[PDB]
Design a protein around this ligand. Structure first.
Ligand SMILES: Cc1cc2nc3c(=O)[nH]c(=O)nc-3n(C[C@H](O)[C@H](O)[C@H](O)COP(=O)(O)OP(=O)(O)OC[C@H]3O[C@@H](n4cnc5c(N)ncnc54)[C@H](O)[C@@H]3O)c2cc1C
Ligand SMILES: [Cl-]
Length: 509
């Protein structure tokens, strides 16, 4: 069989690889995803989806299916520090429910909960035929204008040759592609080992009632503290305990869960495995026509789903730069800006106690003791870890393709702010294709910008907005937004040399 040709070969069908596939599909770029496994999920590793990631899934047309995948609209989203699930509570941060939560002001897409066993199937359905499961990329050989990859269909043992213009490795933290390329990714922190116990407790939610929660942090003893999370809000829970220097023995999985649950109820352990997390960032995000994205480029903190959200955001960044180069309007230096703009996000993120006696006491004394701990927890800004839009929306690119000059801002490099145009359409819904020039009030000079972009064959759409509130939000009369939704330039007056502007934002300067 002759070699199969495609513009982009995506190695790895994990969350990031599928996000990239969705962005390329959205941009009408030919691609193929090879996944060595069968796509099945036996122990969900991800579930929390940040609001920015959802804005991206919105753009890619799957936000609806994600939000309706099964998480209960009436399940509490609270985070609670307790001596035992169903026992004395120390500190609880009320976060409402999916159905009662107040509409977010800075985004059309609040965060979502979609465990991997629901997420994988949905993404695979959206990507369709382009996803090849049970397919293993064995090796790749770069050529001058393309990359040759050898893939083994694990069902037939037959090997196929795939010639792609670009190979994007979304093959995870231990990325064999990164190693093959000779790119180093030195550890940025000691390795953290986590023991994950996935269990099913059918009646636990009923026993908890409104005292149920998404996140439970157990304070069983000074030597035993760990999170226990509602995974699907329908019976599945995941206890994650650290196996550190304090870990002396390996307690029985069932006994650990029973110890963490105050109720005498049905508990069935489904899986008991470990995760060795080593924060690493690739020294380089590409070599020739081979790129690294997701954990392969940056294995980061899973706190608040930061690592996965960053991976999805990096996939969206590379997606538009690849499409622009493939279509021919990108400057030769555009692809290099993927590392320039995304590597700093990863780097910056990495740069970033005992229990009082009687804490589990029933009397009014223990209640007072728990109260005290609650104060320390709150003052330590523990509640800010559940209300920090800046972490999700605040990164601002200061790069070679951005013309320089938490609260939403349209400053160059930042994510253009959300505002409703209609009850169903946000300013964000205007972004994601090509460049967009938003003009508030006057349109003088806009025709000139239009021609400047056409001369370079750079896609541009111009939109005239008459809403004074949105103008106030954006602060300037004209705002040029990039294909990724970030601002490239703004001002009350269009620049004199538009040729220079067009070349700068497309990576040609
Ligand atoms: C045991 C374990 C437990 C984890 N627990 C958590 C957790 O509790 N919380 C959290 O936030 N994160 C957790 N993670 C990490 C989380 O899964 C990732 O951060 C996340 O999905 C990032 O995704 P990624 O898309 O970059 O890569 P991955 O999701 O790692 O996917 C890489 C994909 O590459 C494929 N692949 C690799 N080599 C080849 C090849 N040669 N040919 C074809 N396909 C190939 C794999 O089969 C896989 O599907 C865990 C990871 C592991 C391994
Ligand atoms: Cl090309």
């Amino acid at each position: 069989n002759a070699p199969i040709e495609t513009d982009v070969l995506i190695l790895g069908g994990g969350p990031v690889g599928m996000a990239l596939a969705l962005d390329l599909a959205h941009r009408q770029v030919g691609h193929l995803v090879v996944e060595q496994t069968d796509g099945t999920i036996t122990h969900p590793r991800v579930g929390t989806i940040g609001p920015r990631s959802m804005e991206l899934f919105r753009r890619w047309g799957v936000a609806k299916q994600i939000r309706t995948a099964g998480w209960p609209g009436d399940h509490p989203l609270d985070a609670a520090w307790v001596t035992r699930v169903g026992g004395h509570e120390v500190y609880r941060i009320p976060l409402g429910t999916a159905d009662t939560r107040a509409t977010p002001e800075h985004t059309p897409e609040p965060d979502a909960i979609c465990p991997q066993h629901w997420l994988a199937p949905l993404l695979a359905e959206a990507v369709g035929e382009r996803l090849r499961t049970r397919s293993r990329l064995d090796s790749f050989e770069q050529r001058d204008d393309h990359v040759r990859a050898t893939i083994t269909d694990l069902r037939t043992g037959a090997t196929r040759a795939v010639h792609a213009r670009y190979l994007v490795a979304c093959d995870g933290a231990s990325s064999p592609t990164r190693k093959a390329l000779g790119i180093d990714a030195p550890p940025r922190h000691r390795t953290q080992v986590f023991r994950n116990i996935l269990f099913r407790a059918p009646e636990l939610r009923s026993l908890l009632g409104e005292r149920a929660a998404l996140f439970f942090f157990l304070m069983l003893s000074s030597s035993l503290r760990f999170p226990l999370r509602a995974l699907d809000g329908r019976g599945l829970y995941r206890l994650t305990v650290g196996v550190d220097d304090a870990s002396k023995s390996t307690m029985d999985s069932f006994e650990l869960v029973r110890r963490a649950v105050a109720f005498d109820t049905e508990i069935e352990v489904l899986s008991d495995s470990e995760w060795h997390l080593t924060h690493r960032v690739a020294d380089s995000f590409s070599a020739g026509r081979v790129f690294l994205t997701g954990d392969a480029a940056h294995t980061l903190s899973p706190s608040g789903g930061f690592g996965m959200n960053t991976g999805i955001g990096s996939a969206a960044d590379l997606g538009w730069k690849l499409a622009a180069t493939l279509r021919g309007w990108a400057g030769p230096g555009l692809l290099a800006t993927y590392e320039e703009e995304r590597r700093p996000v990863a780097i910056t993120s990495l740069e970033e106690r005992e229990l009082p006696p009687g804490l589990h006491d029933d009397g009014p004394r223990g209640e007072r003791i728990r109260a005290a701990v609650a104060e320390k927890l709150e003052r330590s800004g523990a509640r800010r870890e559940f209300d920090a839009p800046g972490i999700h929306f605040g990164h601002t690119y200061r790069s070679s393709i951005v013309c320089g000059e938490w609260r939403p801002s349209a400053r160059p490099g930042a994510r253009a702010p959300h505002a409703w145009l209609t009850p169903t359409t946000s300013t964000l819904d205007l972004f994601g294709r090509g460049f967009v020039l938003l003009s508030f009030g006057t349109t003088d000079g806009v025709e000139a910008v239009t021609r400047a972009f056409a001369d370079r064959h750079v896609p541009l759409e111009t939109v005239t907005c008459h809403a004074p509130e949105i103008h106030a939000l954006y602060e300037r009369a004209h705002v040029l937004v990039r294909p990724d939704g970030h601002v490239a330039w703004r001002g009350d007056h269009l620049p004199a040399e538009l040729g220079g502007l067009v070349d700068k934002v497309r990576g040609a300067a």
